[PDB]
């Protein structure tokens, strides 16, 4: 324990008379007021060391402060008792329970899956949503994000997804998920809490809650703890691990804040240059392990700033994660059920859960045909809104009515309403019947004769 400190500038700390410091090492900071704040080591040069304070450097004496260095790297108290119990962003229990007994102490940074040991996404799952089935399939163990906008029903959609996940999946051992929030709103926290309570999955799931009132360091460290927890659940516990993370934008802005506070060289849009790799850290952690049962399925949730799909956040998210589910504000003001844009939203591998032997061979072709009819309907909608209603051909109006029906019926179901995959395929088969016989060029003759009543 070193009581020696030299300088203080902004939200950081620098100490001397120390040696052999470890990168991102756990360090206990005892202030003059008796306040104990946890911190991590930043860099070490010669006999001098520099670290960043999580709780802030506000109200701390230079010569009256003591510091204890563990020397070990970042360590989290992972266990099998975390299920059903809620934890905060700092690791402390938010459930007001007693001391949690750690089964194992492991680095929250997480270990990248070896390429040869990495197994490809397989099987399938039922999300209860038609768009999460027909338009864009969701594999079990794969990783896909969700792009929403501020003011939109992102929390409601996430709640519906989390509630209908394990419910619909059984129609394909219950599915276990993990809830994680970093620097989010108290209202959204209450909504998410009521959502997890209503879903009743809170007993079989774990929760990491980092309030916006709390520091940025804790919020950024919450994702690491959740990653280590999900990893321990998908490896040591050998169970199916679903990853639900929210408010990534706050963590991003906080990351940019930390990058700017250290006067580091910023990347695009004032963000960090390592931001891509920083996101890719927890992005590439998802996948399947050969020889090991269970898998970690990443279902992140982010909000594009000012409803801009061209924002660096969404760009880097797509550059990190493979595939995403976009939520447009255009259909959010329509009053219809949750606004998923079929065009922008896509899955990395939709061909893995398709074909015969899994569900049906009529899935993929119908998806391509429906996407084609929808896109053609959109272009025809633009043309109709441009020139006029009498300036458009028959196929234009047909695809327009087909897309409108697809939005009003197929796209609009409900939050508490979980549509079965069979119901989705049936509704899609009924949706294709609205279009003409020569309308869909992406469909085969056999499937066309089979689906048409």
């Amino acid at each position: 324990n070193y009581n020696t400190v030299s300088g203080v500038n902004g939200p950081l700390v620098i100490l001397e008379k120390v040696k052999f410091p470890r990168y991102n090492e756990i360090v206990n900071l005892t202030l003059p007021d008796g306040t104990v704040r946890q911190g991590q080591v930043l860099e070490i040069r010669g006999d001098r060391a520099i670290v960043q304070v999580f709780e802030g450097t506000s109200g701390i004496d230079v010569k009256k402060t003591t510091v204890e260095f563990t020397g070990e790297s970042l360590r989290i108290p992972v266990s099998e008792d975390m299920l059903g119990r809620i934890f905060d962003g700092s690791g402390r229990p938010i459930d007001n329970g007693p001391k949690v007994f750690a089964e194992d102490y492991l680095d929250i940074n997480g270990s990248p899956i070896n390429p040869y040991a990495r197994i490809y996404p397989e099987e399938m799952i039922s999300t209860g949503v038609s768009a999460i089935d027909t338009m864009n399939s969701i594999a079990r163990g794969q990783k896909i994000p969700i792009f929403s906008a501020s003011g939109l029903p992102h929390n409601e959609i996430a709640a519906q997804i989390c509630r209908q996940a394990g419910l619909v999946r059984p129609t394909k051992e219950n599915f276990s998920i993990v809830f994680a929030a970093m620097g989010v709103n108290l209202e959204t926290a209450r909504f998410f809490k009521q959502d997890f309570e209503e879903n009743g999955s809170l007993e079989r799931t774990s929760l990491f809650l980092n309030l916006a009132n709390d520091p940025t360091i804790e919020r950024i460290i919450t994702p690491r703890l959740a990653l280590t927890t999900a990893e321990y659940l998908a490896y040591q516990t050998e169970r199916h691990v679903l990853t639900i993370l929210t408010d990534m934008s706050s963590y991003a802005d906080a990351l940019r804040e930390v990058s700017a506070a250290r006067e580091e060289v910023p990347g695009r849009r004032g963000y960090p240059g390592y931001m891509y790799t920083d996101l890719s850290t927890i992005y590439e952690r998802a996948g399947r392990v050969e020889g090991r049962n269970g898998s970690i399925t990443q279902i992140p949730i982010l909000t594009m700033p000012n409803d801009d799909i061209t924002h660096p956040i969404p760009d880097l998210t797509g550059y990190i994660t493979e595939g995403q589910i976009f939520v447009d504000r255009q259909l959010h003001n329509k009053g219809i059920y949750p606004p998923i844009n079929v065009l922008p939203s896509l899955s990395r591998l939709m061909k893995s859960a398709i074909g015969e032997g899994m569900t049906r061979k009529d899935h993929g072709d119908v998806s391509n045909q429906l996407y084609a009819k929808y896109a053609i309907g959109k272009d025809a909608a633009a043309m109709k809104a441009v020139v006029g209603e009498e300036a458009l051909s028959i196929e234009d109006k047909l695809s327009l009515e087909f897309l409108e029906k697809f939005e009003k019926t197929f796209i609009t179901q409900g939050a508490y309403e979980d549509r079965t995959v069979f119901e989705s395929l049936d509704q899609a088969w009924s949706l294709l019947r609205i279009y003409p016989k020569e309308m869909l060029n992406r469909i085969s003759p056999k499937i066309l004769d089979e689906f048409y009543d």
Partner: protein, 591 residues
């Protein structure tokens, strides 16, 4: 350790022998003891940033450090006192110094220590276990509200020994002696709490308690519950001051905390002059509105540190009043000035800007300021319930919503009510855009209002859909024509015009139209819905539109008088009129 400045660069001054001082700590620079703030600290020499003029400060002049951060004094003597961004009285400065200007380096107390108050122990005796937030007594401050509860200051837990209550004492006198694990300790009626640290409470809760705006449209369309957060435009000349004053006066909250950032001198002077003119309407007439409220004013000439942190001090005071278990409200005018001051502070801190000249901590500070409000239960044995209703105004430079301040305001605040200058130029009541109005608090507010079976939400959503249909009908009227429509469209248009006159428009100048009661607004919406339903039923009954409009004119004239005639003690008088509307239906079933 006493500091001595070894360097002076512009407003910034670095002083050696400052090792005793800490980071982000206030200090008195020079022999004039000018107000300053410590930015960084290097060894025994700390780098401090003076918020005042650095002129007159020389080398060899001893610099005294406060040894702590920026704070404020919560307790008796705080109310009915105007303050600045540095929390100092302007009126007392004009009374003492007898000058029209404020000298650099001058300092005055926020609460008057020369004012004697009569205090008495309410629910605290000798030998009882108490903690921080627990009321140790009560002292009468204002002439309106009940005696201000003096509570045991934070980080203090023990058994009371010697109580100086009851008796007459000032704010500088210790009214109690508490015995903690640290043995003997002293406690007074006045306390000091950090401006950057929100007031401690027992438990946090969600706010189901609706706050009365007094305005019809405000309570109907975009209702803000007590503890809830709402935002609006900062456009000048749009009549925002009237809406703000009316909201503050008709509020159901116990106290009101107004914290300004910066503005023109004429506006600040007008607000300051119109502030004390307001009178209460609770117990007939108590004292002025300034007595049960707190005012913090900072002009453009005020420091940036006294601007961006002014909201923190105001919220600290509001939460301090909320720590006594009373519902309060925090009003913020021209927050964009505090944002620009935060940008200048970011430039002064050497922090690299993020976007459009905004700081790195922008979103964090905004979220921190937005999370300070809400309804909760304060700490201490008392266990009193309280709330803080956040209200902010944004006045961007370019007016674009792409600005960081606008996005942060819309993001943090769950309720956003736009103010259109054209709507105020329409020769109508207070300007609000019906199209851009939205709130996410509607659900909880509806579920809570259903307890008393006062349900706006049904009629609210109905009138909303009616407004949408009327909007489409208006778009069609500008496309084809108003005479080419059907009977339902015409009835919808007439109902839209009627709702924008005798319903949405409420004159704050009149007696009965100044504050619209919950029962009044509910009965108004009910009567309107009854008229629309009667018209829709008569439209399907085979009655002509002209004959109906001619026969039902009396019903419209009677319904137009439902905004007046004062007190709603006989609200049933309106219900009869609704029955008359049904008779109007019977009149449509004859001719």
């Amino acid at each position: 350790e006493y500091g001595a400045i070894y360097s002076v660069s512009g407003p910034v001054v670095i002083a050696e022998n400052m090792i005793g001082c800490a980071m982000y700590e206030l200090v008195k620079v020079g022999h004039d003891n000018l107000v300053g703030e410590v930015i960084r600290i290097d060894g025994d020499k700390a780098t401090i940033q003076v918020y005042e003029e650095t002129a007159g400060l020389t080398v060899g002049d001893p610099v005294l450090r406060t040894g702590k951060p920026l704070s404020v004094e919560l307790g008796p003597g705080l109310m009915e006192t105007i303050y600045d961004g540095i929390q100092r009285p302007l009126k007392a400065i004009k009374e003492e110094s007898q000058s029209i200007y404020i000298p650099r380096g001058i300092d005055t107390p926020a609460l008057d220590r020369t004012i004697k108050w009569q205090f008495t122990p309410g629910k605290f005796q000798v030998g009882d276990h108490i903690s921080g937030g627990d009321i140790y007594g009560s002292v009468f401050e204002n002439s309106l509200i009940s005696s201000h509860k003096i509570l045991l200051p934070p980080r203090s837990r023990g058994t009371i020994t010697w109580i100086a209550p009851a008796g007459e004492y000032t704010l500088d006198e210790k009214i109690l002696e508490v015995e903690f694990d640290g043995k003997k300790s002293d406690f007074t009626l006045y306390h000091t709490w950090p401006v950057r640290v929100p007031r401690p409470v027992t438990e946090k809760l969600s706010a189901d308690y609706p706050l009365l705006t007094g305005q019809r449209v405000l309570d109907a369309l975009f209702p803000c519950v007590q503890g809830g957060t709402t935002c609006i435009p900062g456009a000048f000349g749009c009549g925002k001051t009237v809406i703000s004053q009316s909201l503050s006066k008709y509020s159901n909250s116990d106290a009101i905390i107004y914290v300004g950032c910066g503005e023109r001198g004429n506006e600040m002077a007008e607000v300051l002059m119109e502030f004390p003119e307001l009178y209460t309407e609770m117990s007939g007439t108590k004292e002025p509105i300034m007595k049960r409220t707190t005012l913090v004013a900072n002009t453009s000439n005020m420091p940036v540190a006294a601007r961006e942190a002014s909201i923190y001090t105001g919220i600290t005071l509001a939460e301090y009043f909320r720590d006594q278990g009373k519902n309060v409200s925090m009003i913020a005018d021209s927050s964009s000035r505090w944002a620009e001051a935060l940008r200048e502070i970011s430039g002064r801190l050497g922090e690299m800007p993020a976007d459009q000249g905004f700081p790195a901590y922008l979103g964090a500070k905004l979220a921190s300021f937005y999370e300070r409000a809400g309804k909760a239960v304060a700490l201490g044995s008392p266990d009193r319930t309280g709330s803080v209703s956040i209200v902010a105004a944004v006045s961007p430079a370019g007016g674009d919503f792409s600005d960081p301040v606008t996005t942060a305001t819309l993001g943090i605040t769950q309720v956003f009510w736009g103010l259109d200058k054209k709507l105020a130029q329409r020769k109508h009541f207070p300007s609000i855009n019906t199209s851009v109005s939205y709130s996410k608090y509607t659900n909880v507010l509806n579920k809570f209002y259903d307890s008393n079976y006062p349900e706006f939400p049904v009629l609210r959503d109905r009138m909303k859909e009616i407004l949408s249909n009327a909007e489409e009908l208006e778009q069609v009227v500008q496309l084809v024509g108003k005479s080419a429509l059907s009977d339902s469209d015409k009835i919808t248009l007439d109902v839209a015009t009627l709702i924008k006159e005798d319903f949405l428009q409420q004159n704050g100048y009149s007696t009965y139209d100044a504050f619209c009661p919950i029962w009044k607004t509910f009965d108004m919406m009910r009567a309107f819905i009854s008229y629309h339903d009667e018209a829709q039923k008569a439209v399907a009954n085979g009655a002509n539109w002209s004959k109906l409009a001619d026969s039902t004119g009396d019903v419209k004239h009677a319904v137009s008088s439902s905004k007046f005639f004062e007190p709603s003690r006989g609200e049933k008088e309106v219900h009869g009129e609704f029955e008359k509307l049904l008779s109007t239906m019977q009149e449509r079933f004859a001719e």
